[PDB]
Design a protein around this ligand. Structure first.
Ligand SMILES: O=P(O)(O)O[C@H]1[C@H](OP(=O)(O)O)[C@@H](OP(=O)(O)O)[C@H](OP(=O)(O)O)[C@@H](OP(=O)(O)O)[C@H]1OP(=O)(O)O
Ligand SMILES: O=P(O)(O)O[C@H]1[C@H](OP(=O)(O)O)[C@@H](OP(=O)(O)O)[C@H](OP(=O)(O)O)[C@@H](OP(=O)(O)O)[C@H]1OP(=O)(O)O
Ligand SMILES: O=P(O)(O)O[C@H]1[C@H](OP(=O)(O)O)[C@@H](OP(=O)(O)O)[C@H](OP(=O)(O)O)[C@@H](OP(=O)(O)O)[C@H]1OP(=O)(O)O
Ligand SMILES: O=P(O)(O)O[C@H]1[C@H](OP(=O)(O)O)[C@@H](OP(=O)(O)O)[C@H](OP(=O)(O)O)[C@@H](OP(=O)(O)O)[C@H]1OP(=O)(O)O
Lengths: 371, 368, 361, 362
């Protein structure tokens, strides 16, 4: 059963059908938006019906289209005509061809393609402690009807329109970077001996929901005890349009039970899973959708393409493993600083997959809320 | 108008005020860091506020897909309590007394002294051709607030803290004593006939921006021609912690093509001024600050104190005048020889020398 | 039968005879090099013959298409004249008698500030180049003309690469056990590891009785115990190369469950013989020679800068505990000890080529 | 112009062999095959078979003490085999110019052979004469009795050709060496850097050796000597070793305390430089005029070096004579080596002049 997402305009004149809510970016290419518009022929008599794909960065408010939104920047706009029909007006995908058959003769196809220079779905609502405002990158699919007045002013009524907020979701490319690895050593004041920390991850790209095995090697040649080893997944968010806001938040944390006594070395693998589920507080962190929606996750790592200015991504999201060592007789006595190293990794969704029609269930596009 | 440098914590609970960005080391003693912390009493209710001075050597940089590798050694750490007041700083300066008056109650003094065994501000980012990694000696003044609970679980909150990267700048001492010319001579025998090179400087210590008069005296009793004379100021950098990196870079150069023929002598005085300004490329040379900052200069000569192991200086910086003579060899020979000598000198900043009217300025140093 | 080691110059003008290939350093003093040079009087007419003792640190090897890079530092040089002649040992007096009237004595002494024979050829996985400390005894002839123009002809010379071998001193103070203990808290409950050796100094070939005592008051299980002899090598001239290699190992699968304690004594013998791979380890001679052993522990003398030793060699017992954690954690600790040769103590002479015997696989 | 053709005739005049060259080019990628023609007297080869063999052999001694065959190949020229038409223009042209009793042969070289190398020891040298020889032999076989065939010497003719090493299309990285010495009681180093313009030099080409002495010592570098040393390793039958100076240059410059000199000396390693032609690896006999220094051996990937018979390599040796040193603070020389390779440069009918194969003497 292929689930199809539909939304109908206030005036019932235009209905939009999409195969998915979420379209895959796997770096090499992006999945195009293929769907159909079902028009009521009586209600579109002498009208033109279009479908637009808009990518926009917004800052100040929670939607690209709200009265007195502090700042909007359009990253991409594309528009096609569905009605009256253009060319052969035959489908291009099996989904379209199948939907046209299942829905009848007032059904017209549209295909809107994504370019390679766009970010993925990223948005952020600040927590009470955070300076800076709500911002996001939204993807709007809008089917709307236009008509002519005798005074020579075309009209685009809201009641004749349907807008869907789709997600552009980051899935992994064919390859991945070298095994992440860090070495750090500290010689404390009045010490002749190093505290050595080595950190390794199994791989460079992890999937949302996948456990991250952080292997930690503390070599303690000091007379001090490592009292605690904390391993964090930190999310780093840089708003790079309108306002240079910066967020760094723990989205996963594990504290080892082992201490590392003087003149000894411990090697240990801690497993973390960075998940929105882990976080009571869903504000102050880069998400791929609205806080109130259930299908909303952590933002995937931004992947900047060669020779694309990072500013047109709007919000930069990166992840790192932070290993923090609490050392006895140190904080207050010999340092006012932390003992930590970071290892960067990328977090995204898994690689994508590699005769008769399908059986269609219809569902309202509106995403499900939490509880 | 005395300019005062202020910086405020993310949470606005703690603000730090310093008389200067740069504290003078003149060998005999180092200028202490005297300043005040302005605390918001509502936001530090039942908290302690401290100020630390940390000197640390660091080695390692962030390369993409290159293994993360870092080394830090603390060369000095000191901490006083500013709030609630106890007079940890043991006494008062006029600057503190004046700033307390101008800023209100909730203003509390701190004094952190430097010892005599520390290097001065030295750091280095490698150029593409250079083998080793970014390293430096940093001086951090940090004002931070702790809770009664933050001391027990060792998570001093970042938003309640403010850190300034000050410079420890090398000035010459007073009572320097009268100064010998820095001079040497070499006899290069070529077919048992001497090419004599004497190099002389006016003095041994020069100041940043001061012209260096290099007198070169070539006495050529050989049958060969000195075809070319190059005079350089070379900076020599030895990283002496974690990794034995070595850099030698020209920071000033003068080339005459004026020639010294057989059985003749030339004396020539070239003036060179070693300046960071002269260098398009600001990487691969020891600086006293970040490349991107405007107030950044060439590092001063390291001054190792009696009975201090040079390794605790982290980066050794020295300067020398290099004289290169291109010598012809015998007429119809497709190639010539080059002889060179060095004269060391030291490069540093000059000897040092009712309320005031205070202008307040963000600590952040100006970019280029 | 006292075996005497001889070697002759290309031109047959100078022949050198030594009592030994290997001279004993027992810390208090070093055995001096006493030998004789046999000259052909026809071929040395109006020439001077000298014998030099050189100790030198060397760094660098010959790699194809890799930039040639070498460093040499002489740590000691001494020279005496043997011919024409200018104390004596019985060995010299006896050899002079047995060899004839063209035989002349030399004595070269070692000072107390030198390392012992240490060298290293890197294994494929190792960064850093071949390096070593060599001891050369060289007999050579100069002409009345060679002193005026700084040339010494190679054919008139003969060089022996002797070893300076580290032995323990005599009348040594009695030895404390080499022992440490660690408490590894896991959820605020201690895993205690004690490691103890019978003594501080062991001899090459001597078994090392390592007593390991795990007291496990944790809720976790010690799944596995590894006990190693590790050799640690620090090149402290020219390049700060670092090598750490297992030269002996025992791995029990013996487990220590929660709220229990196990004591075990393993015997290890750190030997070059144990190691198929003879590269990447500090040796007292060339890999290809049969008499070659593991380097002895470096013995730095009071107020001697360790850098003039060239290569620092130390040994330690490493204990690794695999501990459960639901995979597992591994904790490890070291106990240092020193490894060297035992305390030290006419004839009929057999003559033998100095050249050391290779490994007839 | 005039293509010179090398001919030799059998004692009995029955078989004559014609070659385009005395010397066949090995340029690493491939080796030039031996293409020639045999002219038979049809009366004197009536009912006989004529063959041509290419033999490569290592020899040691002067019966030869030791011989090892490195390669053997043989073709039939007479009676004619297949079409019997030429394969090269040289053959086709020679057949036309010489007549209908002329038959072609092609003998190919494989890639696993050394080049022409031989050595006659000097009086001071231990070890005997040895070399790698390349023989082209045309001979007739016949049968008078059914129990055997016979190979008479008078019906045969042998040429000793050279396999000459010419440079490949590529070249190794620029040769470079650094050496430093701390003398006993000297805190301070004597540094020597050596560089060559390139990795491959040609016979007769000047070698610019750039020498950089940095003298931080209180001693004087009194002399800088630069040698081209030839190193010869006999790797069959007897492990003989020769190292000989084939070129030497001494700079006039001294390097005084706390100074540095950079200086380029030019050397040309040539057999001509050497009065003594014995004890050095040559590409031919001492007595012949066209004889040169052996080219550098080029060992191919996965070929055991022993089948090369004689290994020849070249190096630049730089020797520094230092004051107050030899006798006082060392019994040793101050020197470094930089390896390089030495070989020959990268590599209508014609009008034929005929010449006896025998090489010209000095
Ligand atoms: O972001 P942080 O890790 O907290 O540290 C930064 C960083 O300082 P360091 O990396 O040298 O510690 C900035 O330097 P850049 O990385 O941007 O080059 C520095 O800026 P300046 O050194 O140019 O002053 C800035 O300080 P500032 O507040 O002046 O921007 C400082 O942040 P902190 O306020 O935490 O020290
Ligand atoms: O390299 P060359 O220019 O040919 O000269 C060398 C050199 O002697 P000279 O420099 O006096 O000519 C060798 O000694 P050094 O002078 O380099 O120290 C000498 O051998 P010795 O080292 O034993 O003196 C050797 O002669 P030999 O090969 O007989 O050892 C001789 O080379 P030639 O033999 O080619 O003359
Ligand atoms: O010709 P040299 O430059 O003097 O060097 C060789 C070489 O010494 P190196 O190893 O230092 O190059 C031999 O050692 P290997 O090269 O074969 O490893 C060594 O003999 P050992 O192998 O026994 O050390 C031999 O001396 P000898 O021929 O007496 O055995 C010695 O040349 P010398 O004969 O002049 O010492
Ligand atoms: O032994 P032979 O049957 O008489 O052969 C000789 C001999 O050759 P080999 O010694 O290499 O076997 C000559 O050698 P040398 O006395 O000259 O060293 C050689 O002389 P060239 O190399 O000077 O030519 C001559 O060759 P050729 O006939 O070309 O003059 C060649 O003759 P055969 O091959 O005809 O016997």
């Amino acid at each position: 059963n292929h689930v199809i997402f539909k939304k109908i305009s206030r005036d019932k004149s235009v209905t939009i059908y999409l195969g998915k809510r979420d379209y895959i970016d796997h770096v090499e290419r992006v999945e195009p938006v293929d769907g159909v518009v079902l028009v009521d022929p009586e209600l579109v008599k002498g009208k033109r019906v279009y479908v637009s794909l808009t990518c926009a960065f917004r800052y100040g408010q929670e939607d690209i289209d709200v009265m007195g939104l502090s700042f909007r920047r359009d990253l991409y706009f594309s528009q096609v005509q569905v009605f009256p029909p253009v060319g052969a007006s035959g489908a291009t995908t099996r989904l379209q061809e199948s939907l046209i058959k299942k829905l009848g003769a007032n059904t017209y196809p549209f295909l809107l393609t994504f370019p390679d220079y766009l970010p993925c779905s990223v948005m952020l609502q600040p927590a009470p402690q955070d300076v800076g405002k709500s911002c996001g990158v939204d993807f709007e699919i809008k089917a709307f009807a236009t008509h002519s007045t005798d005074v020579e002013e075309d009209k685009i009524p809201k009641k004749s329109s349907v807008r869907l907020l789709i997600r552009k979701v980051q899935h992994a490319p064919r390859d991945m970077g070298p095994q992440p690895r860090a070495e750090a050593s500290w010689q404390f004041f009045m010490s002749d001996k190093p505290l050595r920390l080595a950190v390794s991850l199994s791989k460079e790209i992890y999937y949302h929901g996948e456990p991250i095995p952080v292997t930690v090697a503390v070599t303690n040649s000091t007379e001090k005890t490592v009292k605690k080893i904390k391993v964090l997944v930190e999310q780093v968010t840089n708003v790079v349009l309108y306002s240079s806001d910066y967020y760094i938040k723990t989205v996963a944390a594990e504290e080892a039970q082992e201490k590392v006594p003087p003149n000894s070395s411990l090697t240990k693998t801690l497993t973390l899973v960075p998940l929105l589920a882990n976080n009571r507080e869903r504000r102050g962190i880069a998400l791929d959708g609205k806080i109130k929606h259930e299908d909303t996750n952590l933002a995937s790592s931004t992947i900047i393409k060669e020779g694309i200015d990072k500013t047109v991504m709007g919000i930069l999201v990166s992840y790192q493993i932070k290993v923090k060592l609490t050392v006895s007789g140190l904080l207050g006595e010999l340092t006012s600083s932390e003992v930590a190293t970071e290892v960067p990794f990328r977090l995204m969704h898994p690689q994508p997959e590699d005769f008769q029609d399908e059986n269609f269930v219809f569902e309202e596009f509106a995403r499900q809320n939490l509880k």
